[PDB]
Amino acid sequence: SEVQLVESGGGLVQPGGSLRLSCAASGFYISYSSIHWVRQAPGKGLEWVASISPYSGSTYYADSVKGRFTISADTSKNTAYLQMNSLRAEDTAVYYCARQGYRRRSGRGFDYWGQGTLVTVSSASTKGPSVFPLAPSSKSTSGGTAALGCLVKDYFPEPVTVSWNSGALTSGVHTFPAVLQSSGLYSLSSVVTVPSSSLGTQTYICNVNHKPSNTKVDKKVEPKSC
Amino acid sequence: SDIQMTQSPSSLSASVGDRVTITCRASQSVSSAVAWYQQKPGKAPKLLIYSASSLYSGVPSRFSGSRSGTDFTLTISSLQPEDFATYYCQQSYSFPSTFGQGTKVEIKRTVAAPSVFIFPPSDEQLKSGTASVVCLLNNFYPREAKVQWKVDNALQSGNSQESVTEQDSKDSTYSLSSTLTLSKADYEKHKVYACEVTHQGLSSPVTKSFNRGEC
RNA sequence: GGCACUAUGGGCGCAGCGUCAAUGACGCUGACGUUACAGGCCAGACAAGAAACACUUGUCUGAUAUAGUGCC
Structure with missing residues (x-):
């Protein structure tokens, strides 16, 4: 060994x-x-x-x-x-x-x-990713479970590291493969489904880490109401 | 004249306990100079079989190798939850070496329907001039599911890209992602954006949507 | 290219001939003797050596492989 x-x-x-x-x-x-x-x-x-x-x-x-x-x-x-x-x-x-x-x-x-x-x-150059929130529209909550996530858009190259709430809340988390866009940059998005009782009570922040460009982002996800 | 090693099937969906067989054929004789590797996602390959029928170390007994002419088969006698990787054959009889293009061997579970969610772009993202509309299919089975983007009851095309997880470990489901990309101008020119999902778990294709300033 | 005939290791001495040394050592050359003993040469197959080829070794199968001298 x-x-x-x-x-x-x-x-x-x-x-x-x-x-x-x-x-x-x-x-x-x-x-x-x-x-x-x-x-x-x-x-x-x-x-x-x-x-x-x-x-x-x-x-x-x-x-x-x-x-x-x-x-x-x-x-x-x-x-x-x-x-x-x-x-x-x-x-x-x-x-x-x-x-x-x-x-x-x-x-x-x-x-x-x-x-x-x-x-x-690649002759494409390094690019840190822009992190946008997919906000949980509790506008609809049927199984008392809304879906929230982060869109991690237009970076190069990969990999990316998406934790959620700094390592806690690993469960029900679905980070997706990156996809190459006609631009020649990658984009992926990570989601987690959570109880919509704890919507607001708990706060949800995805932890993105793209070391090829030395960006440690953190983005908060939450709806915006009327 | 390279020796090609045509692995088949490319995919395989079985359930635990099943007997599984994976075949591979050499375009010329390779004697018995044939290896089998298992590869789980992200990790390096593990040797399973060397010299076409001898079992390398650490390999359980349920695995076994076989040769007949130029026809080489790996067989798993009884599928275990651990034996759910991709599998490759290799010929080492001449140079250059050759591999199969692999066999993905997936778990079989009950048919599960997707819970469909839809996401407008962000104000941050529209602050910068592009609109990504992202729709989510969650924890379903099987894999094959159509997603149709209608904007004001009009089918879209080519302005959207899908993305699918590997099968889950616990409930062995899938999840799929789709993203319609638009200039912020084109986004503000319309009100109804909809996400149309047809899947086996659904008696009728399920739809999710939103208005533009809807709050 | 074909045919014939002839030669082909290892020691051990003999000579010649070297190189460094420094009169030392070990090479190299002998159809030069001598000899216990045998080998040596070329190729293929197979095995083994941490060994796909190359290398080295072993077994097996063939004869070859060189040179020289003639003749064609």
């Missing part, structure tokens, strides 16, 4: 840029394993990217990256690298490094995986 893999080095890059991921083997020696990079485009499945083979240092690449990406290990550092050049947007994914287990114990299965490092390719 001391076996671990840790990726690093991702973030946003313009098209045509370059990014160099690391993968930090702890608990075994990189020297004696095949090491792979697998990416996962957001909303998609797994796509294989590359591998470097032990002893011979022989490498292999995906058809799609064969010429822009380069895999390498530093045995002295117990870290395998990924040199991504001349990035394109469809290179955007979470990138995972994985170890091929021992020939006589797991065949060619990848038995330990990293955590994943996210990499966005």
Whole structure:
């Protein structure tokens, strides 16, 4: 269980840029394993990217990256690298490094995986999100339950972190996936259903946190009446 | 000539206790050089099967791998609440490596109807010149549900974007989001905005709406 | 390119020839002897080595692989 893999080095890059991921083997020696990079485009499945083979240092690449990406290990550092050049947007994914287990114990299965490092390719720039309240119209309360939420609009890139009332009130909370808009920015909205007795008695404030732009927003949600 | 690994089905909706089978076919022979991974959302993949039928470690016995020619199948003998991830096949027989595009395996529950809520834009948001009208479908099952935007009994199109949760853990429901985007000018040109939901749980499509200054 | 014939390890000495040293050591070259013993060479299949390829080792199957000399 001391076996671990840790990726690093991702973030946003313009098209045509370059990014160099690391993968930090702890608990075994990189020297004696095949090491792979697998990416996962957001909303998609797994796509294989590359591998470097032990002893011979022989490498292999995906058809799609064969010429822009380069895999390498530093045995002295117990870290395998990924040199991504001349990035394109469809290179955007979470990138995972994985170890091929021992020939006589797991065949060619990848038995330990990293955590994943996210990499966005975009010529869009950073943007903090604007937080608007979806106010609970207690104008209607049938099952004694109104719905309230925060609209988190026009940010880039993702992720975003939406707590509600600072970690309390986790129950019935539905934060949605972001969606890309024709603008090229993302928008998502988080909601929570609550008793409409406690409407007013309790006060409801969503906790947004978009660290790519260093914005810690807090927005209060409440109706406005006549 | 890459070897393609065509996984099927793309989706699978079962209930606990069921026997489940997921197939994958190699466009050429891969010998038995085939792995199976389970992936739950946000997390890294877990190896389940290596060498097409041998079970990696930590894998319960209900899982099992199978080969027949170029036809590789994972089967779960009796589905458990834990065995509700996406599943991928991989060929490692030649380079470049290949994966299936995955199989999403979802819980099956009783048919639940959506509780429909609708939201005008904010004064803050209209203070800045754009109007987002957001409608909410809450805690229903199954997934497939139509949402129709009428503005003054007129169907809209293309000015709205949907968004759906993953299945809940406790009651294994869904929730869906829809957002009509407008310039603040176009928003102020109309009075009736409506959100029309057709779902199986509804005998008749349920509608929610509002006026412009309605308070 | 084909055919024939001939040669092919390891020590151990012999010579020659080096390099650093500093008259030391170890290489390199012998159809140069000698020899317990045997190997050496090329390729394929399969296995194993922390091992998809490459590398190294083992088993199996073939013969090959070099050079030299003729003839065609």
